[PDB]
Design a protein around this motif. Structure first.
Motif, PDB file in Angstrom:
ATOM      1  N   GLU C  32       0.815  -1.210   0.000  1.00 61.91           N
ATOM      2  CA  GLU C  32       0.000   0.000   0.000  1.00 61.91           C
ATOM      3  C   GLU C  32       0.861   1.279   0.000  1.00 61.91           C
ATOM      4  O   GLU C  32       1.799   1.393   0.792  1.00 61.91           O
ATOM      5  CB  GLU C  32      -0.918  -0.009   1.226  1.00 61.91           C
ATOM      6  CG  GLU C  32      -2.003  -1.069   1.160  1.00 61.91           C
ATOM      7  CD  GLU C  32      -3.072  -0.734   0.118  1.00 61.91           C
ATOM      8  OE1 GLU C  32      -3.842   0.219   0.357  1.00 61.91           O
ATOM      9  OE2 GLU C  32      -3.140  -1.408  -0.934  1.00 61.91           O
ATOM     10  N   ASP C  69      -8.218  -0.693  -7.563  1.00 57.32           N
ATOM     11  CA  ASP C  69      -7.139  -1.073  -6.668  1.00 57.32           C
ATOM     12  C   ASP C  69      -5.887  -0.409  -7.200  1.00 57.32           C
ATOM     13  O   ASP C  69      -4.928  -0.192  -6.469  1.00 57.32           O
ATOM     14  CB  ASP C  69      -6.924  -2.586  -6.663  1.00 57.32           C
ATOM     15  CG  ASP C  69      -8.015  -3.342  -5.915  1.00 57.32           C
ATOM     16  OD1 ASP C  69      -8.406  -2.925  -4.799  1.00 57.32           O
ATOM     17  OD2 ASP C  69      -8.467  -4.378  -6.449  1.00 57.32           O
TER      18      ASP C  69
ATOM     19  N   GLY D  30      -8.195  -7.121   1.772  1.00 61.42           N
ATOM     20  CA  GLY D  30      -7.539  -6.142   2.618  1.00 61.42           C
ATOM     21  C   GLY D  30      -7.899  -6.287   4.094  1.00 61.42           C
ATOM     22  O   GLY D  30      -7.576  -5.412   4.906  1.00 61.42           O
TER      23      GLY D  30
END
Ligand SMILES: [Cl-]
Ligand SMILES: [Cl-]
Ligand SMILES: [Mg+2]
Ligand SMILES: [Mg+2]
Ligand SMILES: [Mg+2]
Ligand SMILES: [Mg+2]
Ligand SMILES: [Mg+2]
Ligand SMILES: [Mg+2]
Ligand SMILES: [Mg+2]
Ligand SMILES: [Mg+2]
Ligand SMILES: [Mg+2]
Ligand code: NA
Ligand code: NA
Ligand code: NA
Ligand code: NA
Ligand code: NA
Ligand code: NA
Lengths: 140, 154, 95, 186, 156
Positions: C32, C69, D30
């Motif tokens: 991320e 994403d 996630g």
RNA sequence: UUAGGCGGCCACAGCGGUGGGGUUGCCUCCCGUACCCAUCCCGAACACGGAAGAUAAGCCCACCAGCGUUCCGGGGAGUACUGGAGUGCGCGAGCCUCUGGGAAACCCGGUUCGCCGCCACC
RNA sequence: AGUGCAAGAGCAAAAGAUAGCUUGACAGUGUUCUUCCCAACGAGGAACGCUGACGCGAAAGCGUGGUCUAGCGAACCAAUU
RNA sequence: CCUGUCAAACUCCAAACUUACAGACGCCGUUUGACGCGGGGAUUCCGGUGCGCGGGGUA
């Protein structure tokens, strides 16, 4: 040490390599459980061009079903030696193959953390002859 | 601290070389500047190695040259001891010279032109087609080597 | 060039050294990044999706938002400004 | 192995432990994962998260430390798995964990299996986990009824000594009842 | 055609037969001469050393090799010596035989690329250097100037 | 971690080989099919249920370098190649000097038979 | 090896094989890159979303056709929703 | 096993170097307003040579 090193029978495959069957019936009786179709691969001159196609049946007998079969199969066979696997197996005959191996084989046939059986823990042609010979018959 | 002096002209010299010369405050042939010995400055004199003449000068010589060719960031004013004293942190040319050599300060920091506009070498230099090791006047010099050149252009 | 397709002249950059062959680790495909972060663009020959034009391989862009994403990285082609839709699998933290 | 150009799998594939393709899909949500794992004699339920040097387990439950609350029966069975699921579930809640996705490792998604059991338990514990009710066991098999009836065809105790002879799906209720309030490590 | 047309190493390497066809066969008969049955078990070993990178047409090699071996018959058709030409004509060569339009030429031959100082020929002999003469005749038919070098031999 | 679960880096971890280890935390092989579930045929696998036996596999632990791989010393080599410079040499192909970088093969000797994170646990 | 076809590139508990089920080769609207490096330029193409409707899966999730780079066409007029 | 050779459309290796971003120094900009933005006017789209690296060609 032993007990967990001494041979045992794991499946006895009895297949009839025809070229196109009605033969299933006999296999079902000679063993005691349904057969399976034998499709073939590759297109060939023996008018066998069909990829997916029934060209014979087989039956994989486990446990008693295997013994109770061999207890008549073996008798009908003479051969031994040379005609044995490097892994302690042997095929005679209509075919009838006998797969032999020691106790911890599942390690190799399970899903999780599977592992190839070490060469040391493998069964040798010799160790195989002895086990079977020692069960109603003679070697060579 | 090394003394840089452009010996070859701008015509035909790569741009990136010429700009490097210019960032080193030299814009004319025979113009000389004083450059600290650092990685960043070393890379630059190396790139410039073929059109210039450099090396570490002797306190004395630096003094001669400073006295003779130094200039205030603006104007004619002669940089002589008094000027130095009445304008810089030091008391005389020598004190300045030492500070420069020991790389404690710079000409600019003391209100002086980064450029020492030297005069043509009296007697002529050794040629601009060969390095020193080849009898030429290009590349790095001996302290005695740099001195001779500088003093000749004092 | 003899042709002007996107993969023109990319035999080298979009090919794996034999040992680095086969599916890549997921850990870097899930990484991320936050708007502001410098990231290096380099396509993973193993990873089909989330790619960008081979020509940008080698760029170090700044993450500025995302789309799906996929991340939006701003880079400067030559002197032109551009926004590149690239997935984590093809990105790396600078420094 | 063979040459410079030879390609060796990732360690965890050599060992046949982690299905990476399935791991990527999982990680995609996630969320934290609800690692449901088994053993011939036990059942473990972890709540893993993603970390800089490798996963991080925030909460867990082993069918072994199930006796620590009054479990006196085997631990490699339906009821066993459920409770461990619920037990891990609660410690999970305590941890501040609220949702996760079910990772069943190299296990099979067979209906009414113990891994769905573990899921069903972790769910009741308060955790929010994408699921599908009709792939779960019919409660009774979760209590251990199938085993009680199997001991009905007795003639010989199903449990070598162990506890009881006709077994107890009620001992199951007693324990679930217990975990649903107070007690230590929860 | 003249050697002046292909004696320089100024073109890229052109050797991929998978992309070239119509390659004339090599005129070179053999690369191992003399007693090839025996191994380099000789006292003396001289070599013909080329002095400038050049290209040597299989034409030149065969003519240079025959001239020396054919001459090494000062020792007998089955004499005691072993001769070796360590280079093979890999580099394919073309000719534009329309003017300069579509001029990529057509394969006309092959040439071996030798760098200056490499030894193109090696002979093994007992203290009986007639070989030194077989080479004054060999570098006589190759483009470059050459050095006739002796290695194991301090029997001067 | 006196044997476990999830991982990161993805051979320094591969391949091959030796020794050691379990009334128990344990993991396994193992025993066994009423159930949930299962084999185009087989409780082999999968799934469920379970401890009569075992440490022989696996696994964990300790170790070997013969092959594969990683890094390091010495040699090859400041060699090959090269960014900048030259009214240096050569008929020329091309070479040389100065300046700033700098290799591969191979040989010999070492290194490598994984390292690390989170959790659980006489 | 296979993956429809050039060549180069990707893929092994798969991106290939078998079986089964299914029609996401769905309707709508965008963002970005490309076409055209840099650096303007259309059609076309691709990647990545969102809205809506679906398919499959336990589920995370995958499906904006076939693993990737070729298989394409302005206005005017016509026919069609 | 030993021995003799190669590759623009080979690669177990592998430079110099080119290049993206950042920091440092340098230089530059904040009355000489840089970097950048908007707009007016062009000219221009026969080029050539040296050096380095090239591809074609006997040249
Ligand atoms: Cl892009
Ligand atoms: Cl498991
Ligand atoms: Mg002034
Ligand atoms: Mg004079
Ligand atoms: Mg002169
Ligand atoms: Mg290339
Ligand atoms: Mg042992
Ligand atoms: Mg696709
Ligand atoms: Mg018209
Ligand atoms: Mg119409
Ligand atoms: Mg380049
Ligand atoms: Na990969
Ligand atoms: Na013509
Ligand atoms: Na000659
Ligand atoms: Na069928
Ligand atoms: Na063991
Ligand atoms: Na477009």
């Amino acid at each position: 040490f032993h007990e967990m090193r001494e041979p045992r029978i794991e499946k006895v495959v009895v297949h009839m390599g025809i070229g196109h069957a009605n033969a299933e019936d006999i296999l079902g009786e000679i063993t005691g459980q349904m057969p399976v179709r034998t499709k073939a691969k590759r297109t060939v001159g023996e008018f066998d061009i069909r990829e997916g196609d029934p060209i014979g049946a087989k039956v994989t007998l486990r446990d008693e079903m295997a013994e109770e079969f061999l207890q008549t199969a073996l008798p009908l066979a003479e051969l031994a030696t040379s005609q044995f696997d490097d892994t302690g197996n042997f095929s005679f005959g209509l075919d009838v193959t006998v797969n032999l191996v020691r106790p911890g084989y599942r390690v190799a046939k399970r899903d999780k953390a599977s592992r190839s059986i070490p060469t040391k823990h493998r069964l040798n042609p010799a160790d195989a002859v002895a086990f079977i010979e020692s069960t109603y018959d003679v070697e060579v | 601290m090394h003394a840089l002096v452009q010996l070859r002209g701008e015509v035909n010299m790569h741009t990136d070389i010429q700009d490097t010369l210019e960032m080193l405050n030299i814009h004319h042939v025979n113009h000389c500047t004083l450059v600290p010995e650092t990685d960043a400055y070393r890379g630059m004199v190396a790139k410039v190695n073929d059109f210039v003449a450099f090396g570490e000068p002797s306190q004395e010589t630096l003094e001669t040259v400073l006295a003779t060719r130094a200039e205030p960031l603006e104007g004619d004013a002669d940089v002589d001891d008094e000027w130095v004293a009445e304008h810089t942190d030091y008391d005389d040319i020598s004190g300045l010279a030492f500070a420069l050599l020991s790389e404690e300060t710079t000409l600019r920091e003391q209100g002086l032109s980064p450029t020492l506009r030297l005069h043509p070498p009296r007697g002529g230099h050794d040629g601009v087609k060969h390095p020193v090791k080849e009898g030429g006047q290009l590349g790095k010099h001996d302290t005695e080597g740099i001195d001779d050149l500088l003093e000749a252009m004092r | 060039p003899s042709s002007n397709g996107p993969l023109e002249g990319t035999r080298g950059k979009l090919k794996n050294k034999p040992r680095d062959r086969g599916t890549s680790p997921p850990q870097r495909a899930v990484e991320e990044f936050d708007d502001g972060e410098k990231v290096h663009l380099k396509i993973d020959p193993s990873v089909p999706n989330g790619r960008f034009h081979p020509r940008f391989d080698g760029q170090t862009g700044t993450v500025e938002g995302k789309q799906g994403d996929a991340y939006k990285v701003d880079i400067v082609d030559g002197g032109k400004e551009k926004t590149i839709i690239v997935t984590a699998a093809h990105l790396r933290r600078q420094e | 192995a063979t040459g410079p150009r030879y390609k060796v799998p990732m360690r965890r594939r050599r060992e046949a432990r982690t299905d990476y393709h399935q791991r990527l899909r999982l990680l995609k949500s996630g969320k934290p994962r609800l690692v449901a794992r088994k053993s011939n004699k036990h059942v473990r339920a972890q709540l893993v998260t993603l970390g800089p040097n490798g996963d991080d387990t925030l909460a867990s439950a082993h069918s072994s430390d199930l006796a620590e609350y009054g479990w006196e029966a085997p631990t490699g069975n339906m009821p066993s798995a459920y409770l461990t699921g619920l037990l891990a579930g609660l410690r999970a809640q305590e941890a501040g964990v609220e949702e996760a996705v079910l990772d069943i490792g190299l296990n099979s998604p067979t209906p009414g299996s113990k891994v769905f059991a573990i899921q069903e338990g972790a769910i009741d514990a308060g955790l929010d986990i994408p699921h599908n009710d009709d792939v779960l066991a019919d409660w009774q098999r979760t209590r251990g009824a199938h085993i009680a009836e199997y001991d009905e065809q007795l003639e010989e105790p199903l449990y070598s000594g162990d506890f009881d002879a006709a077994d107890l799906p009620e001992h199951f209720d007693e324990l679930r009842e217990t975990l649903l309030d107070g007690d230590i490590e929860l | 055609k003249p050697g002046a047309m292909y004696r320089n190493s100024s073109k890229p390497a052109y050797t991929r037969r998978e992309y070239i066809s119509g390659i004339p066969g090599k005129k070179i008969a053999q690369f191992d001469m003399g007693n090839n049955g025996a191994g380099p078990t000789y006292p003396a070993q001289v070599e013909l050393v080329v002095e400038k990178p050049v290209q040597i047409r299989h034409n030149a090699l065969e003519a240079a090799r025959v001239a020396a071996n054919r001459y090494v018959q000062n020792s007998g058709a089955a004499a005691n010596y072993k001769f070796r030409i360590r280079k093979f004509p890999f580099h394919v060569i073309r000719e534009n035989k329309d003017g300069m339009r579509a001029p990529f030429g057509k394969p006309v031959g092959t040439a071996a690329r030798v760098h200056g100082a490499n030894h193109i020929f090696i002979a093994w002999v007992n203290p009986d250097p007639n070989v030194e003469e077989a080479w004054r005749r060999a570098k006589m038919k190759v483009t470059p100037t050459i050095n006739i070098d002796s290695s194991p031999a301090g029997n001067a």
